[PDB]
Subunit: 192 residues, 4 copies
């Protein structure tokens, strides 16, 4: 009750996972991901469920940075082509809709970045760049972690934080500031 | 990739700060309101709308009757319900307008916001303060690493998942209980 | 500005609505209603513009007092063998919709297909097939495709059919507009 | 077994589309087309079912080669005074749509109102008032609302009008179905 111990324990776990990401992120792979995003004609993003919401948050920021970007399945998304890149977000790398769409994109000839916790997954095996962002750590039991962070919550939070870190890095590389992003952000529903 | 790693360091500092300062009394009031509602409605604009949807989906997994404002199957809000509005500034126009209409109907309102005396907070029954930009943080370095609402958004997402962990404990739920409810058609 | 193509499109739509009314299988309509009315909940799905039609229909089913969800949306729960899935696809071959519908059938849900193609993958797996055509028998394809590209005519005809179905269910349930008003969302509309 | 309300609804819809074909203001249509073509980008919005219609139309404008966005969606950028907003609202009083349109007018964007009410709040703000009515002169409200509740007839008429407008723009631009096929999304359809 009043102490809300599970709330606090969850936050401790999040702290440990962000530290883990800091200490283990593959910087070479981050560079390869940035290179594909920069070299593509346009960027398409996809995830299912909560990973879809992360994909949308990332796509919105790429738009703020000045990229030509779309979310798969959304209204104004045009035909994907062999000059584009698809970024698929799936913790397991087995998410059926994301795997099926990514296979179709690969057959068209688009490149694929997989943001996933599983380097050996169906999605990762198809990918040009496999950006590994773990949910569960080596030393953790899944059953214990899932009591605080069910259904892949930890992967989703870590992937969100990673993608916002990637935005920070791209801003630095492109000498973009907050004011640059502000010029592109939507204002009709927020009022600035 | 120094800026990437510096961003992660800032997020680390911010989560430590959240851990130290979360108002546990207000958390209890928020949970009480969620539990007492007939239906729960959630709303946010832009990236905060994605946070709102992530939280609504988890509430559904936890067994609540829950909807996202503006979405297809969302029914008429009533004075038996609770609206949860997510807005970093507490001044987001669409969220303030919708929340005022909900209050006129008689719904209860939880504001998840960084500004305790914002328009949104002033209307709310429970003001759940979650801050993005911290007290005396160098606005210049933070804005460059974490532009627009980025820090508030990550902090709110982390807080709402922490709230889910708390509710699971209070209801004695395990992952399998949530797995029974989750949608499988797209995920597999 | 005579806008002759705009006016011609409207004339074509009227002919298609008359064609739908003249040829509709009223028995299949009854079977669709029976599945909707006996389901624990109704799930709907379509890709692209057919998805927008599915969402319009789902919203109206909610107004009629059904428990209803859109596949892939935020609060949609696990589908079960107590439910019915309504899939909308002009060709009946839309890959995402076929794949989702087959998964639903494997779980044991019932399936209604709203499609232009009675022998398509989606139609052949369905419990009830509502055949709503795009091109008519004596209609030149090249004309229709210029005025109504990419399945526009199937989509309009399917939307009109589904609103007609709502009118029917309202009558059967003795509902008026006021009953639906009690359930419709007001926060964005006022 | 006869589904009389279903069939009557279809008869009424076809009469409404004939009514549209004979009462539509072609001058206003031409003004709408001119704004769509002169705008840097087109933004569309509607609430609820009218939002689904807005998305269907935005998708088609994308197929035609326009730069187009749906208000509130992920990749939609800041609207400017060089853009046009198309707002769809049957009553013209839809609060969310009116509020968004007011902000767009403060920025200086042009506004097209697709509405049934020429003196509504939304219409009064608009550069072009594209009147598409749901109820006909001689119709009784209580009768139409039983078959077509909550603005159903406006919504169908507006959807059909916007598809007719697309047919007209294709003709004026010498576009064919194959041109639109080049641009349409394929991942979820196959």
């Amino acid at each position: 009750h009043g102490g809300h111990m599970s709330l606090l324990r969850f936050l401790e776990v999040v702290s440990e996972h962000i530290k883990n990401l800091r200490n283990h992120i593959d910087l070479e792979t981050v560079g390869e991901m940035i290179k594909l995003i920069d070299s593509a004609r346009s960027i398409f993003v996809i995830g299912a469920g909560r990973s879809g919401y992360i994909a949308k948050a990332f796509a919105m920021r790429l738009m703020h940075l000045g990229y030509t970007v779309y979310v798969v399945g959304e209204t104004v998304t045009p035909r994907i082509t062999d000059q584009d890149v698809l970024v698929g977000i799936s913790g397991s790398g087995e998410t059926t809709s994301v795997v099926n769409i990514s296979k179709k994109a690969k057959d068209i000839g688009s490149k694929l970045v997989a943001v996933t916790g599983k380097r050996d997954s169906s999605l990762a095996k198809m990918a040009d760049v496999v950006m590994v962002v773990k949910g569960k750590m080596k030393q953790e039991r899944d059953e214990i972690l899932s009591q605080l962070a069910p259904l892949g919550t930890m992967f989703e939070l870590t992937a969100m934080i990673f993608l916002d870190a990637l935005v920070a890095e791209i801003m630095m590389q492109k000498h973009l500031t907050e004011k640059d992003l502000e010029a592109r952000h939507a204002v009709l529903e927020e009022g600035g």
